[PDB]
Design a protein around this ligand. Structure first.
Ligand SMILES: [Zn+2]
Ligand SMILES: [Zn+2]
Ligand SMILES: [Zn+2]
Ligand SMILES: [Zn+2]
Lengths: 698, 698
């Protein structure tokens, strides 16, 4: 069912958990450093988990793809063939940017965070700056212990703040990956789709120094020895059984105001989808012509194409369940309940009204803001503005620097700067500059930016050509020029005759004013949002509903049951797929080209002792009514006894709307069954040492 | 499961019947004039049944479609609106061609038939003619009492012969029909499809004279009083429950030789498909700017579509299931077994070789025979050749006239020649003549017909155009002129300058020679087929299996259980559809335009006391693993106690291939649930007096 619950609130939902079938105590699972929640780890974008007392980590295949590719040659293709390390000495480095983060300590810092905000009085900009400062000092002081990375998370609009201190493991090595036609069986064709037959798993091992402390790759490091780790289920998972997922969903916006949601559906999503489709067509058209373009812009185009299809998909989904109407009616109920109460209801009504006013304010300049932002996100303008901005911040002391530009941020910046070379071709970037300039000159007089207008020196076709021609002369194309600016001082930037840097210098005072305006609105939001969300929570309580905060990168549990769904009368998706289902999709061409040893074993009905007779086969994937979103790939699925029954890896297309809604009839997570991991590792691409390490071998 | 069981054999499958859930005794349901089976009646191409002691009869809506349309006018459009007769005086005549045939008596005549055949000796043609003589006398004797029509059926290639004497009711009236968007919801879109949501039912009432004998329509007639009629189930039908169907399946070819099957799949089906699509195209093109054509050729075009699509989808089914390989392999086993028998097995092996030889004889002229038969079946040539043939037969004693051309056949002939008016337009029929002649002159020289060659005077497009010009002068376009020829002497035909007549007179000697060749072949088949089929039966029995004869238009029982099917891993069709499914398909446009009272009742959940809580609604249609074919439309579906739970009206698209094989996994009948009939009659298009008559009033 719906909900991304923080572990601390699980005792409060004891009743719902027990009814769904949970057999462990909610008090046990509420401990974020305990058994099993302390086994759950973050990879930076994916979830994973510990599965042995010697640092073995399981996650999805696409979560490990980076590492698999990295250790692949032109002439030895782990992507195709799989990877296996028969001893730990055979495990290969995932490279110096790979991480496993493990929770060390959590602290509720709400009282301190609220005091700092409260000290700013009625000054909205001051409130923002005060929270910024609180956070930066907190993180600094927490991270003064080497080995650790800290994060401050705000819950429910700032009703609650929590500080997480994570051990930062920096020597992560690949231990196993199934072949690519298992890991990614069905490729993009089966993306978002059920029925699903994908063995989406892989294994790392975490390493530390012999002193126990994190260290970069070294042959003297040894496996990390986790305090907690997960065990394979010994009861066979069946339709209707309790399941829960623990993982790190990135962000949701489940409590958006009716007007905010309407603006997203009516303007934001259609407008962004449009520009994205125009960009896609431009890149498609040029990559045919050219070919450097084709290879370097392929991932950028895929990103646009992805967002574009998901926005279109959500808009249809909304109309399908009347999400806007449902939201409007619940909001009306809330406002009615508050209005009924006297004076006592007024602060929350006032807060609702302030939230509406801020949405009008950001709506008044929505076209300008989007155009300027995406114009400045083109490659040469992006790097110019980012570099110049850094040089301004450098000229203050670190403690005053804008997050993103502190000393902790510099590796990330240099990272991006080097990466840019993989996705930049000047002929193509000129076309993207042109597109965004033509969007710019379509803005009304009252949405223009004087500094840009003055730079452009006119606003017809010929103005834009002159401007493209000037910018052509920049030298920030090359990595090596860019690295010189990364270290250059503000007055160098101001002396430069580089036409991209001169753009940056011309517009920066304006960009800073716009930034200050966002921060001002954001400080008003600090005041009004928690108040409104508390009133929402109180209303829901009166109605007997428990409330969960929006996702915010922290560890959450979602629970429910293994179950199919039926989009149409007279048919149902069954909760499981099976081995025979995989073979029935064989074409053998990419992406339906299973390994031969899989075809042979299924034909032989070598079930490896893993069959579930209720389904007549070994299970492959299954559906459940769990509530996940981006961040949850790789999350472990646990059973009623907190034992591992699979990994989360996708959802059905009805899950594409997970930022905004959950449809209990149709939304389903797709998981790969723990028995299918075992079956692949027994019958297809053998990992006897891992099976034994996990006590299911052996 | 598989099998179209003759009732007389039901005692010998007591075990399977009971295992499947039958609660009546096998003996009781074997009784063809008893309860319930004596309630089942034939309409001539559809099955129906009695459902009251005052002669009320239920069947499908497309079975009653002729009657509905006949009583329809633009001002009162019964097809669209439905029909109800609240009193028996309101019921309207289904027309002079409508029939209800009620079984009076069956006799096994196998001994006298086999004797008549034996007395003709070794001459194949004489054997056919002996069987013809036997059959004609038998029927003449049986029909001597007014009011009855009789038929002789041969089972299992002539192993058994039975004579059925039926009361021929000729006054049939429409009592109820649901609106068209209920009777045919989904139209041709949902045809052969599941999920299905179609209320495919209608009611008639059978009338006889006040003396109790059959009579043509008269207002002095009164309702027939049946000895046995079905009652509605009092038990709610659920998933897994026993169901059976009784009706008159037309033809199957489940025991064909591998080479007979191959000929059909490789030649017959693809050839016919192709011709029919050519014809369908010409008729659809011509109809777009001539609506006389389009109105009059619509039944005809839809006949072609049905066969075309069925053959295209049998052919797919054959490949899905490797039907070719199955047959060859199964025939391999039988032949091996037979060789394993003594001398004992030699007759069946000789029979097998004979049948192969007959097949090669038929194949040597297959193109000639099909082209000439389809040419001659165009409207004017069909009419001329038939009317000339009749004049030839009228010159013999009735006893010696060909079946189809006896006294007893005359109304049916006169029927046909009147009804041709409804489906003929000269300029369309010319295009059809032209297609077929163009096929004719494309024939290989050794597949030509000397008489057609002489009449053409050449073998080219020029000769074709001359023939069409010649034929266009016929007078047989008018009903009046056809009825003259109906009555004419053969001398008159042979003196006629009517060019269609001239054609018939020129070709008839040929047609009678080809008829004689067919009959000679059938005379050989008469000897070989039953020996081979008896061998297949013995073989099947040596392997522990029960055997049933191919369909031959006689009454059969098929039994099984309510069940869905799963065509892909990860999904299932559920056994029932529901009211909410009807409404989810609504578009407001034909064919997905339910009556508003339907939409209103489902929205208010007026389930009228008919809901089955196991499916959360009133059921609509359901699937089961019964074995039906063409002729079974309208068959009553009965439960374990012999009570009415549905009507058969279609099958899923996977069957179709059924003619050649029954696929236990995928073959399903689609029925309309008796609750849905009740529901429509209560809540949508009300007939409280009929439900009262059926003891299901509220
Ligand atoms: Zn512990
Ligand atoms: Zn972290
Ligand atoms: Zn805490
Ligand atoms: Zn109900």
């Amino acid at each position: 069912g719906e909900g991304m619950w923080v572990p601390q609130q699980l005792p409060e939902i004891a009743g719902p958990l027990k009814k769904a079938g949970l057999k462990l105590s909610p008090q046990q699972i509420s401990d974020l450093t305990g058994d099993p929640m302390g086994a759950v780890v973050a990879l930076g974008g994916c979830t994973a988990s510990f599965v042995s007392p010697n640092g073995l980590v399981v996650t999805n295949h696409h979560c490990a793809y980076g590492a698999i590719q990295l250790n692949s040659t032109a002439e030895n293709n782990l992507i195709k063939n799989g990877f296996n390390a028969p001893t730990t000495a055979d495990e290969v480095s995932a490279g110096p940017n790979a991480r496993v983060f493990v929770l060390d300590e959590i602290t509720d810092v709400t009282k301190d965070a609220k005091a700092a905000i409260a000290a700013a009085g009625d000054d909205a900009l001051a409130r923002t700056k005060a929270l910024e400062a609180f956070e930066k000092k907190l993180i600094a002081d927490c991270e003064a212990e080497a080995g650790f990375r800290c994060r401050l998370y705000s819950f429910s609009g700032g009703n609650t703040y929590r500080l997480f201190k994570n051990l930062e493991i920096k020597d992560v090595r690949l231990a196993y990956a199934p072949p690519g036609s298992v890991g990614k069986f069905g490729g993009d064709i089966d993306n978002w789709m059920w029925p699903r037959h994908t063995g989406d798993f892989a294994f790392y091992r975490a390493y530390v120094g012999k002193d126990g402390k994190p260290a970069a790759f070294s042959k003297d490091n040894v496996p990390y020895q986790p305090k907690h780790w997960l065990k394979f289920a010994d009861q066979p998972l069946g339709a209707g059984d309790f399941v829960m997922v623990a993982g790190y969903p990135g962000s949701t916006n489940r409590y958006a105001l009716a007007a905010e949601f309407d603006n997203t559906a009516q303007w934001t999503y259609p407008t962004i989808a449009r520009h994205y489709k125009n960009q896609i067509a431009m890149v498609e058209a040029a990559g045919k012509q050219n070919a450097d373009i084709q290879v370097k812009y392929a991932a950028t185009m895929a990103g646009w194409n992805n967002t574009s299809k998901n926005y279109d998909g959500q808009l249809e989904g909304f109309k399908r369940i009347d999400a806007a109407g449902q939201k409007l009616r619940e909001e009306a109920a809330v406002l009615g309940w508050l209005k009924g109460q006297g004076a006592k209801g007024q602060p929350a009504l006032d807060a609702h009204a302030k939230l509406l006013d801020l949405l009008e304010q950001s709506k008044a300049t929505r076209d300008r803001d989007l155009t300027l932002a995406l114009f400045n996100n083109t490659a040469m303008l992006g790097s110019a503005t980012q570099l110049y901005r850094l040089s301004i911040e450098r000229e203050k002391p670190n403690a005053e620097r804008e997050s993103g530009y502190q000393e902790r941020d510099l590796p990330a910046i240099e990272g991006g700067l080097k990466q840019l070379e993989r996705r930049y071709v000047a002929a193509m970037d000129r076309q993207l500059q042109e597109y965004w300039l033509n969007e710019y000159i379509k803005l009304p007089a009252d949405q223009r930016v004087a500094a840009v207008d003055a730079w452009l020196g006119g606003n017809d076709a010929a103005a834009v050509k002159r401007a493209l021609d000037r910018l052509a002369g920049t030298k920030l194309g090359s990595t090596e020029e860019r690295l010189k600016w990364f270290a250059a001082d503000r007055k160098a930037f101001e002396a430069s005759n580089d036409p991209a840097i001169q753009y940056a210098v011309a517009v920066m005072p304006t960009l800073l004013k716009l930034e200050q305006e966002r921060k001002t609105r954001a400080g008003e939001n600090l005041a009004a949002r928690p108040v409104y969300l508390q009133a929402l929570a109180d209303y829901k309580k009166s109605q007997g509903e428990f409330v969960y905060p929006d996702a915010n990168l922290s560890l959450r549990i979602t629970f429910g049951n293994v179950m199919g769904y039926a989009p149409k009368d007279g048919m149902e998706y069954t909760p499981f797929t099976t081995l025979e289902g995989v073979v029935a999709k064989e074409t053998g061409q990419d992406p339906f080209d299973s390994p031969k040893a899989l075809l042979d074993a299924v034909a032989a009905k070598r079930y490896g002792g893993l069959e579930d007779k209720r389904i007549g086969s070994v299970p492959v994937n299954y559906l459940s009514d769990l509530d996940i979103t981006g961040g949850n790939a790789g999350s472990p699925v646990l059973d009623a006894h907190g034992k591992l029954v699979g990994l989360a890896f996708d959802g059905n297309w009805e899950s594409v709307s997970s930022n905004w809604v959950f449809d209990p009839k149709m939304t389903r997570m797709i998981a790969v069954d723990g028995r299918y991991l075992r079956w692949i590792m027994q019958e297809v691409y053998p990992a006897p040492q891992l099976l034994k390490e996990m006590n299911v071998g052996k």
